[PDB]
């Protein structure tokens, strides 16, 4: 029954609070296209202010999932293809050697040469255009998943490009109004910043996201649990949505290849359900998210499929994962990181005891 969901959540996902000293957090589950809030704790220490369906957070690497999604978009707005290079739309780059990638090798991180993270010496519009500009290949292209902001920052800075638009106002313009998300953000106005939590880092000292280069398209939405319960919905249920916004989530939703049991999709991970437990920590092993892989096609075509994607900045955790055909999801949002798999394993708990 219905009346578990609040039980199973206390049960699973309130000791974390305790255990890690987390000062805030929000889980979400949606069934049935029902939606349950459950709030715990405050979202800044100093102001007593407690978290609410108001607060707002930040994703960190689930933002990916909306970069994923503007591109889906535009490919569908026949605005760009995925077998494309960033030459047809960043003029600077036309015939460089970054001009030999595509957009879906960038997307899904399976370009030669690009780590987790820009160097901290690149910062400006120009450092990022000079970075690209004098980019040069390694590995065997397509081969080699290795996990990367400049990656699907690229992507994104590119998708923007053919829309014609900084990337900021095709979230806040287009891609969020069609999700109907009302306090998503890339930059959080003036009129919300009361709330926006703070996060916490691990001297529980509070902290917000500093600017980076390309951190909008690669970690840098905000959002609140309601919103992401909708986009969740979105996810399990987008027949009901505009058919350009339908058609960039089925794009999202695409396996592209493997490695080993994940299944990288735009932005999602992706699973055969039901998985296991170490499965899904797997995708979130440094062996995975830290190191090279040699990336498979895709072999079995799982019959039924779920979906997941963790994130963080400096001060917040991020958790999302769903399951189209037992029409559920749950969304876990906190103002201080806790480990992945602690985010993974109470998920997976709660999700199994209501797939009742
Ligand atoms: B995304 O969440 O996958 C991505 C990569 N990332 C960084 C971290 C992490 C883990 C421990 C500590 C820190 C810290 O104090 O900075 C970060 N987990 N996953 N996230 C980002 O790149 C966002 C950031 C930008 C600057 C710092 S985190």
Same mark, same amino acid.
């Given at each position: ?45 100093? @102001? ?23 591109? %889906?978009?535009?490919?569908?707005? %026949? ?14 780059? /036309? ?15 399976? =370009? ?6 820009? &160097? @901290? ?29 400049? =990656?699907?920052?690229?992507? +994104? ?24 998300? /009302? ?6 106005? /003036? ?7 703070? %996060? ?11 600017? %980076?280069?390309? @951190?909008?398209?690669?970690? +840098? ?5 309601? @919103? ?23 794009? !999202?939703?695409? +396996? ?45 075509? &799982? ?6 994607? !963790?994130?963080?900045?400096? +001060? ?22 806790? &480990? ?17």
């Amino acid at each position: 029954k219905d009346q578990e969901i609040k039980k199973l959540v206390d049960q699973n996902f309130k000791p974390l609070l305790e255990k890690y000293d987390v000062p805030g957090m929000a889980v979400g589950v949606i069934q049935n296209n029902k939606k349950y809030e459950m709030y715990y704790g405050l979202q800044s220490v100093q @102001d007593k202010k407690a978290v609410n369906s108001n607060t707002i957070f930040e994703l960190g690497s689930v933002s990916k999932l909306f970069t994923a999604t503007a591109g %889906g978009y535009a490919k569908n707005k %026949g605005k760009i293809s995925f077998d494309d290079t960033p030459g047809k739309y960043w003029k600077e780059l /036309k015939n460089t050697p970054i001009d030999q990638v595509n957009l879906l090798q960038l997307a899904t991180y399976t =370009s030669g040469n690009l780590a987790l993270q820009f &160097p @901290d010496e690149v910062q400006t519009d120009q450092q990022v255009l000079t970075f690209f500009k004098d980019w040069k290949p390694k590995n065997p292209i397509g081969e080699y998943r290795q996990y990367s902001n400049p =990656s699907i920052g690229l992507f +994104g800075k590119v998708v923007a490009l053919s829309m014609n638009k900084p990337f900021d106002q095709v979230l806040e313009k287009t891609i969020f109004p069609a999700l109907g998300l /009302k306090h998503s953000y890339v930059n959080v106005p /003036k009129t919300q910043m009361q709330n926006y939590a703070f %996060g916490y880092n691990q001297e529980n000292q509070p902290i917000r996201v500093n600017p %980076g280069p390309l @951190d909008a398209p690669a970690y +840098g939405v905000k959002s609140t649990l309601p @919103d992401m319960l909708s986009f969740i919905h979105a996810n399990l249920n987008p027949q009901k949505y505009p058919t350009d916004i339908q058609r960039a989530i089925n794009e !999202t939703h695409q +396996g592209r290849y493997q490695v080993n049991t994940m299944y990288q999709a735009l932005g999602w991970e992706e699973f055969s359900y039901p998985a296991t437990l170490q499965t899904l920590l797997d995708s979130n092993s440094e062996q995975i998210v830290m190191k090279p892989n040699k990336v498979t096609a895709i072999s079995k075509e &799982p019959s039924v499929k779920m979906y997941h994607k !963790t994130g963080s900045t400096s +001060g917040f955790g991020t958790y999302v994962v769903f399951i189209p055909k037992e029409n559920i999801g749950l969304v876990m949002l906190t103002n201080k990181r806790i &480990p992945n798999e602690e985010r993974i394993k109470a998920a997976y708990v709660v999700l199994n005891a209501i797939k009742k």
